[PDB]
Write an enzyme that holds these catalytic residues in place. Structure first.
Site, PDB file in Angstrom:
ATOM      1  N   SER A   1      66.160 -18.405   6.379  1.00  0.00           N
ATOM      2  CA  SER A   1      65.789 -17.040   5.984  1.00  0.00           C
ATOM      3  C   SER A   1      65.111 -17.106   4.620  1.00  0.00           C
ATOM      4  CB  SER A   1      67.027 -16.147   6.076  1.00  0.00           C
ATOM      5  OG  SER A   1      66.729 -14.824   5.669  1.00  0.00           O
TER       6      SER A   1
ATOM      7  N   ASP B   1      61.537 -12.566  15.255  1.00  0.00           N
ATOM      8  CA  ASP B   1      62.582 -12.678  14.248  1.00  0.00           C
ATOM      9  C   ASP B   1      63.113 -11.299  13.870  1.00  0.00           C
ATOM     10  OD1 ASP B   1      63.236 -12.685  11.093  1.00  0.00           O
ATOM     11  OD2 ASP B   1      63.773 -14.632  11.953  1.00  0.00           O
TER      12      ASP B   1
ATOM     13  N   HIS C   1      67.795 -14.467  14.383  1.00  0.00           N
ATOM     14  CA  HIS C   1      67.524 -14.743  12.977  1.00  0.00           C
ATOM     15  C   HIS C   1      68.372 -15.929  12.542  1.00  0.00           C
ATOM     16  CE1 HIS C   1      66.098 -14.151   8.980  1.00  0.00           C
ATOM     17  NE2 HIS C   1      67.256 -13.752   8.488  1.00  0.00           N
TER      18      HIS C   1
HETATM   19  C1  LIG Z   1      66.031 -11.693   5.276  1.00  0.00           C
HETATM   20  C2  LIG Z   1      64.954 -12.337   4.413  1.00  0.00           C
HETATM   21  O1  LIG Z   1      65.237 -13.193   3.644  1.00  0.00           O
HETATM   22  N1  LIG Z   1      63.583 -11.883   4.545  1.00  0.00           N
HETATM   23  C3  LIG Z   1      63.127 -10.851   5.457  1.00  0.00           C
HETATM   24  C4  LIG Z   1      61.785 -10.428   4.933  1.00  0.00           C
HETATM   25  C5  LIG Z   1      61.309 -11.565   4.025  1.00  0.00           C
HETATM   26  C6  LIG Z   1      62.402 -12.409   3.804  1.00  0.00           C
HETATM   27  C7  LIG Z   1      62.267 -13.558   3.003  1.00  0.00           C
HETATM   28  C8  LIG Z   1      61.042 -13.855   2.420  1.00  0.00           C
HETATM   29  C9  LIG Z   1      59.946 -13.010   2.633  1.00  0.00           C
HETATM   30 CL1  LIG Z   1      58.386 -13.416   1.874  1.00  0.00          CL
HETATM   31  C10 LIG Z   1      60.062 -11.867   3.430  1.00  0.00           C
HETATM   32  C11 LIG Z   1      58.809 -10.999   3.606  1.00  0.00           C
HETATM   33  F1  LIG Z   1      59.058  -9.806   4.217  1.00  0.00           F
HETATM   34  F2  LIG Z   1      58.286 -10.744   2.373  1.00  0.00           F
HETATM   35  F3  LIG Z   1      57.882 -11.680   4.335  1.00  0.00           F
END
Ligand SMILES: CC(=O)N1CCc2c1ccc(Cl)c2C(F)(F)F
Ligand SMILES: *[C@@H]1O[C@H](CO)[C@@H](O)[C@H](O)[C@H]1NC(C)=O
Length: 359
Positions: free
Chosen positions: A145, A253, A302
Protein backbone atom coordinates in the site's frame (compact mmCIF):
# COMPACT_ATOMS: atom_id res chain seq x y z
CA UNK A 1 8.87 -13.23 16.09
CA UNK A 2 10.70 -10.16 14.88
CA UNK A 3 12.20 -8.15 17.73
CA UNK A 4 11.85 -4.38 18.05
CA UNK A 5 14.91 -2.13 17.78
CA UNK A 6 14.40 1.59 18.23
CA UNK A 7 16.79 3.67 16.15
CA UNK A 8 20.00 4.63 17.93
CA UNK A 9 19.89 7.95 16.04
CA UNK A 10 17.02 9.54 17.96
CA UNK A 11 16.92 12.48 15.54
CA UNK A 12 15.14 10.12 13.10
CA UNK A 13 11.66 10.09 14.60
CA UNK A 14 8.03 9.17 14.06
CA UNK A 15 5.46 11.95 13.58
CA UNK A 16 5.35 12.99 17.25
CA UNK A 17 9.12 12.95 17.83
CA UNK A 18 9.30 9.47 19.35
CA UNK A 19 12.13 7.37 17.88
CA UNK A 20 11.39 5.32 14.78
CA UNK A 21 12.54 1.74 14.58
CA UNK A 22 12.41 -1.67 12.96
CA UNK A 23 11.56 -5.26 13.85
CA UNK A 24 14.32 -7.74 13.05
CA UNK A 25 14.49 -11.52 12.85
CA UNK A 26 17.99 -12.52 11.82
CA UNK A 27 18.91 -15.63 9.85
CA UNK A 28 22.60 -16.48 10.12
CA UNK A 29 24.23 -17.98 7.06
CA UNK A 30 21.69 -16.21 4.85
CA UNK A 31 22.88 -13.29 2.72
CA UNK A 32 19.31 -12.34 1.72
CA UNK A 33 17.74 -9.36 3.49
CA UNK A 34 14.06 -8.41 3.23
CA UNK A 35 13.17 -4.89 4.40
CA UNK A 36 9.38 -4.44 4.40
CA UNK A 37 7.71 -1.02 4.47
CA UNK A 38 4.37 -0.98 6.28
CA UNK A 39 1.47 0.93 4.75
CA UNK A 40 -1.42 2.84 6.24
CA UNK A 41 -2.62 5.81 4.14
CA UNK A 42 -1.15 9.23 5.10
CA UNK A 43 -2.15 12.67 6.36
CA UNK A 44 -1.40 15.91 4.53
CA UNK A 45 -2.37 18.75 6.88
CA UNK A 46 -2.42 19.61 10.58
CA UNK A 47 -6.17 18.98 10.84
CA UNK A 48 -6.13 15.48 9.35
CA UNK A 49 -2.89 14.53 11.12
CA UNK A 50 -4.36 15.59 14.48
CA UNK A 51 -7.35 13.30 13.88
CA UNK A 52 -4.97 10.51 12.86
CA UNK A 53 -3.14 11.04 16.16
CA UNK A 54 -6.13 10.26 18.45
CA UNK A 55 -7.39 7.23 16.54
CA UNK A 56 -4.42 5.80 14.60
CA UNK A 57 -1.55 6.73 16.90
CA UNK A 58 0.60 3.64 16.29
CA UNK A 59 0.96 5.00 12.75
CA UNK A 60 2.34 8.26 14.15
CA UNK A 61 4.31 7.23 17.24
CA UNK A 62 6.39 4.40 18.69
CA UNK A 63 5.29 4.99 22.29
CA UNK A 64 2.87 2.03 22.27
CA UNK A 65 4.70 -0.36 19.94
CA UNK A 66 4.98 -3.97 21.13
CA UNK A 67 8.48 -5.33 21.53
CA UNK A 68 7.82 -8.21 19.10
CA UNK A 69 5.78 -8.89 15.98
CA UNK A 70 4.94 -12.13 14.18
CA UNK A 71 6.21 -12.41 10.62
CA UNK A 72 3.40 -13.24 8.19
CA UNK A 73 3.31 -13.96 4.48
CA UNK A 74 6.58 -12.96 2.83
CA UNK A 75 7.92 -12.12 6.31
CA UNK A 76 7.16 -15.63 7.61
CA UNK A 77 10.10 -17.92 8.34
CA UNK A 78 8.02 -21.07 7.63
CA UNK A 79 8.44 -22.58 4.13
CA UNK A 80 4.79 -23.65 4.17
CA UNK A 81 3.70 -20.01 4.60
CA UNK A 82 6.55 -18.40 2.60
CA UNK A 83 7.87 -20.57 -0.26
CA UNK A 84 9.86 -17.58 -1.54
CA UNK A 85 12.31 -16.33 1.11
CA UNK A 86 11.47 -18.25 4.29
CA UNK A 87 15.18 -18.36 5.27
CA UNK A 88 15.97 -14.68 4.70
CA UNK A 89 16.81 -12.03 7.26
CA UNK A 90 13.45 -10.41 8.05
CA UNK A 91 12.99 -6.69 8.73
CA UNK A 92 9.59 -5.04 9.30
CA UNK A 93 9.82 -1.23 9.33
CA UNK A 94 6.72 0.28 11.01
CA UNK A 95 5.01 3.13 9.15
CA UNK A 96 4.92 6.05 11.60
CA UNK A 97 5.65 9.05 9.35
CA UNK A 98 2.31 9.34 7.47
CA UNK A 99 4.20 10.64 4.42
CA UNK A 100 4.18 7.66 2.00
CA UNK A 101 7.81 7.22 3.12
CA UNK A 102 8.80 10.44 1.33
CA UNK A 103 9.44 12.94 4.12
CA UNK A 104 12.71 14.52 5.20
CA UNK A 105 11.36 17.08 7.68
CA UNK A 106 12.12 17.24 11.40
CA UNK A 107 9.61 18.30 14.03
CA UNK A 108 10.45 21.83 15.07
CA UNK A 109 9.52 25.35 16.03
CA UNK A 110 7.70 25.62 12.72
CA UNK A 111 6.49 21.99 12.35
CA UNK A 112 4.05 20.27 14.70
CA UNK A 113 4.88 16.85 13.24
CA UNK A 114 8.02 15.22 11.87
CA UNK A 115 7.78 13.60 8.43
CA UNK A 116 10.96 11.54 8.12
CA UNK A 117 9.89 8.49 6.11
CA UNK A 118 12.76 8.73 3.62
CA UNK A 119 15.26 9.24 6.45
CA UNK A 120 13.81 6.38 8.51
CA UNK A 121 14.60 3.96 5.67
CA UNK A 122 18.14 5.34 5.32
CA UNK A 123 18.77 5.11 9.07
CA UNK A 124 17.42 1.55 9.30
CA UNK A 125 19.74 0.48 6.48
CA UNK A 126 22.65 2.27 8.16
CA UNK A 127 22.13 0.58 11.53
CA UNK A 128 21.46 -2.84 9.98
CA UNK A 129 24.87 -2.83 8.27
CA UNK A 130 26.49 -3.38 11.66
CA UNK A 131 24.10 -6.29 12.32
CA UNK A 132 24.97 -8.43 9.27
CA UNK A 133 23.62 -6.44 6.31
CA UNK A 134 27.25 -5.68 5.41
CA UNK A 135 27.53 -9.33 4.36
CA UNK A 136 24.32 -9.27 2.33
CA UNK A 137 24.16 -10.26 -1.32
CA UNK A 138 20.57 -9.16 -2.03
CA UNK A 139 18.57 -6.46 -0.24
CA UNK A 140 14.91 -6.67 -1.26
CA UNK A 141 13.08 -3.47 -0.30
CA UNK A 142 9.43 -4.51 -0.14
CA UNK A 143 6.26 -2.77 0.97
CA UNK A 144 2.46 -2.81 0.83
CA UNK A 145 0.00 0.00 0.00
CA UNK A 146 1.71 3.27 1.04
CA UNK A 147 4.75 1.10 1.71
CA UNK A 148 4.56 -0.14 -1.87
CA UNK A 149 4.69 3.43 -3.15
CA UNK A 150 7.50 3.97 -0.65
CA UNK A 151 9.46 1.21 -2.39
CA UNK A 152 9.20 3.06 -5.71
CA UNK A 153 10.29 6.32 -4.05
CA UNK A 154 13.22 4.91 -2.07
CA UNK A 155 14.65 1.78 -3.74
CA UNK A 156 17.20 3.73 -5.79
CA UNK A 157 18.20 5.88 -2.81
CA UNK A 158 18.95 2.73 -0.81
CA UNK A 159 21.08 1.51 -3.71
CA UNK A 160 22.92 4.85 -3.89
CA UNK A 161 23.31 4.85 -0.10
CA UNK A 162 25.00 1.45 -0.07
CA UNK A 163 27.15 2.38 -3.07
CA UNK A 164 28.41 5.55 -1.38
CA UNK A 165 28.96 3.68 1.90
CA UNK A 166 31.26 1.27 0.05
CA UNK A 167 28.97 -1.76 -0.49
CA UNK A 168 28.68 -2.07 -4.29
CA UNK A 169 28.19 -5.86 -4.15
CA UNK A 170 24.81 -5.70 -2.38
CA UNK A 171 22.12 -6.00 -5.06
CA UNK A 172 19.25 -3.68 -4.11
CA UNK A 173 15.86 -4.68 -5.53
CA UNK A 174 12.28 -3.51 -5.02
CA UNK A 175 8.95 -5.26 -4.47
CA UNK A 176 6.05 -2.79 -4.66
CA UNK A 177 2.77 -4.33 -3.47
CA UNK A 178 -0.48 -2.37 -3.95
CA UNK A 179 1.31 0.96 -4.38
CA UNK A 180 0.80 1.36 -8.14
CA UNK A 181 -1.94 3.99 -8.40
CA UNK A 182 -3.52 5.97 -11.23
CA UNK A 183 -4.10 9.72 -11.25
CA UNK A 184 -7.43 9.11 -12.97
CA UNK A 185 -10.73 10.93 -12.54
CA UNK A 186 -13.08 10.09 -9.71
CA UNK A 187 -16.27 8.23 -10.55
CA UNK A 188 -18.01 11.03 -8.63
CA UNK A 189 -16.16 14.25 -7.89
CA UNK A 190 -15.40 15.36 -4.35
CA UNK A 191 -13.51 18.39 -3.16
CA UNK A 192 -10.40 17.36 -1.27
CA UNK A 193 -11.71 17.76 2.29
CA UNK A 194 -10.30 14.63 3.99
CA UNK A 195 -7.87 11.79 3.33
CA UNK A 196 -9.50 8.68 1.91
CA UNK A 197 -11.83 10.33 -0.63
CA UNK A 198 -9.49 13.11 -1.76
CA UNK A 199 -8.57 12.73 -5.42
CA UNK A 200 -5.12 11.15 -5.91
CA UNK A 201 -3.45 14.19 -7.51
CA UNK A 202 -4.70 16.73 -4.97
CA UNK A 203 -3.81 14.55 -1.97
CA UNK A 204 -0.20 14.13 -3.10
CA UNK A 205 0.19 17.74 -4.27
CA UNK A 206 -0.73 18.86 -0.75
CA UNK A 207 1.21 16.09 0.99
CA UNK A 208 4.57 16.60 -0.70
CA UNK A 209 4.57 20.28 0.28
CA UNK A 210 3.42 19.53 3.84
CA UNK A 211 5.96 16.74 4.38
CA UNK A 212 8.83 18.29 2.41
CA UNK A 213 8.65 15.05 0.49
CA UNK A 214 11.54 13.84 -1.66
CA UNK A 215 11.27 11.84 -4.88
CA UNK A 216 13.84 9.90 -6.94
CA UNK A 217 16.37 12.17 -8.61
CA UNK A 218 15.82 11.22 -12.25
CA UNK A 219 12.05 11.48 -11.85
CA UNK A 220 12.50 14.88 -10.20
CA UNK A 221 14.66 15.99 -13.13
CA UNK A 222 11.87 15.12 -15.58
CA UNK A 223 8.90 16.75 -13.85
CA UNK A 224 11.01 19.45 -12.17
CA UNK A 225 10.19 21.98 -9.46
CA UNK A 226 6.55 22.10 -8.37
CA UNK A 227 5.51 18.95 -10.25
CA UNK A 228 7.25 16.31 -8.11
CA UNK A 229 3.86 14.89 -7.06
CA UNK A 230 3.94 13.02 -10.39
CA UNK A 231 6.70 10.78 -9.02
CA UNK A 232 4.33 9.23 -6.46
CA UNK A 233 2.53 7.45 -9.32
CA UNK A 234 4.09 4.16 -10.34
CA UNK A 235 3.67 4.35 -14.11
CA UNK A 236 5.50 7.71 -14.12
CA UNK A 237 8.30 6.97 -11.64
CA UNK A 238 9.02 3.32 -12.58
CA UNK A 239 10.67 4.10 -15.98
CA UNK A 240 13.13 6.41 -14.18
CA UNK A 241 14.28 3.74 -11.70
CA UNK A 242 17.40 1.62 -12.14
CA UNK A 243 17.03 -1.01 -9.43
CA UNK A 244 14.98 -4.05 -10.51
CA UNK A 245 11.42 -3.61 -9.22
CA UNK A 246 8.72 -6.29 -9.11
CA UNK A 247 5.26 -4.69 -9.23
CA UNK A 248 2.31 -6.35 -7.49
CA UNK A 249 -1.08 -4.70 -8.01
CA UNK A 250 -4.68 -5.87 -7.97
CA UNK A 251 -6.34 -4.69 -11.18
CA UNK A 252 -9.31 -3.40 -9.16
CA UNK A 253 -7.50 -2.17 -6.05
CA UNK A 254 -9.87 -1.22 -3.24
CA UNK A 255 -7.82 1.80 -2.16
CA UNK A 256 -7.75 3.05 -5.75
CA UNK A 257 -11.54 2.73 -5.92
CA UNK A 258 -11.83 4.49 -2.55
CA UNK A 259 -9.96 7.61 -3.68
CA UNK A 260 -12.02 7.35 -6.88
CA UNK A 261 -15.13 7.73 -4.68
CA UNK A 262 -16.39 4.28 -5.71
CA UNK A 263 -18.19 2.45 -2.90
CA UNK A 264 -19.23 -1.03 -4.00
CA UNK A 265 -22.40 -1.69 -2.02
CA UNK A 266 -23.37 -5.21 -3.02
CA UNK A 267 -26.20 -3.43 -4.80
CA UNK A 268 -26.61 -3.90 -8.56
CA UNK A 269 -23.90 -2.18 -10.62
CA UNK A 270 -25.35 0.13 -13.26
CA UNK A 271 -23.89 0.63 -16.73
CA UNK A 272 -21.94 3.76 -15.81
CA UNK A 273 -20.16 2.17 -12.85
CA UNK A 274 -19.62 -1.07 -14.78
CA UNK A 275 -17.83 0.84 -17.55
CA UNK A 276 -15.82 2.77 -14.96
CA UNK A 277 -14.63 -0.38 -13.18
CA UNK A 278 -13.84 -2.15 -16.45
CA UNK A 279 -11.95 0.89 -17.73
CA UNK A 280 -9.95 1.08 -14.48
CA UNK A 281 -8.91 -2.52 -14.92
CA UNK A 282 -7.77 -1.73 -18.45
CA UNK A 283 -5.55 1.11 -17.26
CA UNK A 284 -3.49 -0.91 -14.85
CA UNK A 285 -3.26 -3.62 -17.50
CA UNK A 286 -2.00 -1.03 -19.97
CA UNK A 287 0.37 0.64 -17.48
CA UNK A 288 1.92 -2.77 -16.72
CA UNK A 289 2.40 -3.87 -20.35
CA UNK A 290 6.11 -2.95 -20.33
CA UNK A 291 6.76 -3.92 -16.70
CA UNK A 292 8.62 -7.24 -17.12
CA UNK A 293 8.32 -8.33 -13.46
CA UNK A 294 4.69 -7.89 -12.43
CA UNK A 295 1.83 -9.80 -10.81
CA UNK A 296 -1.62 -8.28 -11.41
CA UNK A 297 -4.68 -10.43 -10.70
CA UNK A 298 -8.18 -9.32 -11.67
CA UNK A 299 -9.51 -9.03 -8.12
CA UNK A 300 -11.19 -6.45 -5.92
CA UNK A 301 -8.79 -6.41 -2.96
CA UNK A 302 -5.92 -4.51 -1.33
CA UNK A 303 -2.41 -5.66 -0.31
CA UNK A 304 -1.00 -9.21 -0.66
CA UNK A 305 2.53 -9.99 0.38
CA UNK A 306 2.24 -10.07 4.20
CA UNK A 307 -1.11 -11.87 4.23
CA UNK A 308 -0.74 -15.40 5.60
CA UNK A 309 -2.63 -16.82 2.59
CA UNK A 310 -0.71 -14.83 -0.04
CA UNK A 311 0.27 -18.18 -1.61
CA UNK A 312 -3.30 -18.89 -2.77
CA UNK A 313 -3.69 -16.36 -5.59
CA UNK A 314 -2.57 -17.39 -9.08
CA UNK A 315 -2.34 -15.69 -12.47
CA UNK A 316 -2.25 -18.04 -15.47
CA UNK A 317 -1.68 -20.86 -12.98
CA UNK A 318 1.38 -19.28 -11.34
CA UNK A 319 1.40 -18.10 -7.73
CA UNK A 320 3.12 -14.94 -6.52
CA UNK A 321 5.79 -16.81 -4.49
CA UNK A 322 6.60 -18.76 -7.65
CA UNK A 323 6.70 -15.59 -9.77
CA UNK A 324 9.08 -13.99 -7.28
CA UNK A 325 11.30 -17.09 -7.36
CA UNK A 326 11.31 -16.89 -11.16
CA UNK A 327 12.27 -13.23 -10.79
CA UNK A 328 15.21 -14.35 -8.63
CA UNK A 329 16.34 -16.79 -11.32
CA UNK A 330 15.95 -14.16 -14.04
CA UNK A 331 18.40 -11.94 -12.13
CA UNK A 332 21.13 -14.60 -12.01
CA UNK A 333 16.25 -14.82 -21.98
CA UNK A 334 13.04 -16.15 -20.42
CA UNK A 335 12.80 -19.25 -18.27
CA UNK A 336 10.92 -22.38 -19.33
CA UNK A 337 7.63 -22.50 -17.43
CA UNK A 338 8.79 -20.03 -14.76
CA UNK A 339 7.27 -16.66 -15.70
CA UNK A 340 7.72 -13.22 -14.17
CA UNK A 341 5.17 -11.07 -16.09
CA UNK A 342 1.71 -12.21 -14.94
CA UNK A 343 -1.10 -9.76 -15.72
CA UNK A 344 -4.71 -10.93 -15.90
CA UNK A 345 -6.60 -10.03 -19.07
CA UNK A 346 -10.16 -10.72 -17.91
CA UNK A 347 -12.24 -7.60 -17.35
CA UNK A 348 -14.21 -7.93 -14.10
CA UNK A 349 -13.54 -8.33 -10.36
CA UNK A 350 -13.07 -11.94 -9.44
CA UNK A 351 -13.02 -13.37 -12.97
CA UNK A 352 -9.86 -15.03 -11.69
CA UNK A 353 -11.15 -17.92 -9.54
CA UNK A 354 -8.18 -17.67 -7.14
CA UNK A 355 -9.09 -14.16 -5.95
CA UNK A 356 -9.25 -13.65 -2.17
CA UNK A 357 -12.71 -14.54 -0.89
CA UNK A 358 -12.83 -11.92 1.86
CA UNK A 359 -13.73 -14.62 4.40
C1 LIG B 1 -4.10 3.33 1.13
C2 LIG B 1 -2.93 4.06 0.49
O1 LIG B 1 -1.85 4.02 0.98
N1 LIG B 1 -3.15 4.80 -0.74
C3 LIG B 1 -4.42 4.91 -1.44
C4 LIG B 1 -4.27 6.09 -2.35
C5 LIG B 1 -2.76 6.33 -2.49
C6 LIG B 1 -2.12 5.56 -1.52
C7 LIG B 1 -0.72 5.56 -1.40
C8 LIG B 1 0.04 6.34 -2.27
C9 LIG B 1 -0.60 7.12 -3.24
CL1 LIG B 1 0.40 8.12 -4.33
C10 LIG B 1 -1.99 7.13 -3.36
C11 LIG B 1 -2.60 8.02 -4.46
F1 LIG B 1 -3.95 8.12 -4.38
F2 LIG B 1 -2.06 9.27 -4.34
F3 LIG B 1 -2.27 7.52 -5.68
C1 LIG C 1 21.23 11.14 12.50
O1 LIG C 1 20.46 11.33 11.30
C2 LIG C 1 20.57 12.65 10.74
C3 LIG C 1 19.62 12.71 9.57
O2 LIG C 1 19.81 11.62 8.68
C4 LIG C 1 22.02 12.92 10.35
O3 LIG C 1 22.13 14.24 9.83
C5 LIG C 1 22.91 12.76 11.57
O4 LIG C 1 24.28 12.91 11.19
C6 LIG C 1 22.71 11.39 12.21
N1 LIG C 1 23.50 11.27 13.43
C7 LIG C 1 24.49 10.39 13.58
C8 LIG C 1 25.20 10.41 14.90
O5 LIG C 1 24.80 9.60 12.69
Amino acid sequence: DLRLHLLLNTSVTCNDGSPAGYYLKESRGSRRWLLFLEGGWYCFNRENCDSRYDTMRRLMSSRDWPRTRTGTGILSSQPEENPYWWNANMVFIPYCSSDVWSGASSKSEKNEYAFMGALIIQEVVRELLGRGLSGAKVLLLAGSSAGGTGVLLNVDRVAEQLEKLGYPAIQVRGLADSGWFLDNKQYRHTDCVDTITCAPTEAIRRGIRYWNGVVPERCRRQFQEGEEWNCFFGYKVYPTLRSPVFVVQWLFDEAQLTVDNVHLTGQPVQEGLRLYIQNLGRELRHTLKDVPASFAPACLSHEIIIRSHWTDVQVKGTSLPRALHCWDRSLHTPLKGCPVHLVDSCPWPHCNPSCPTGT
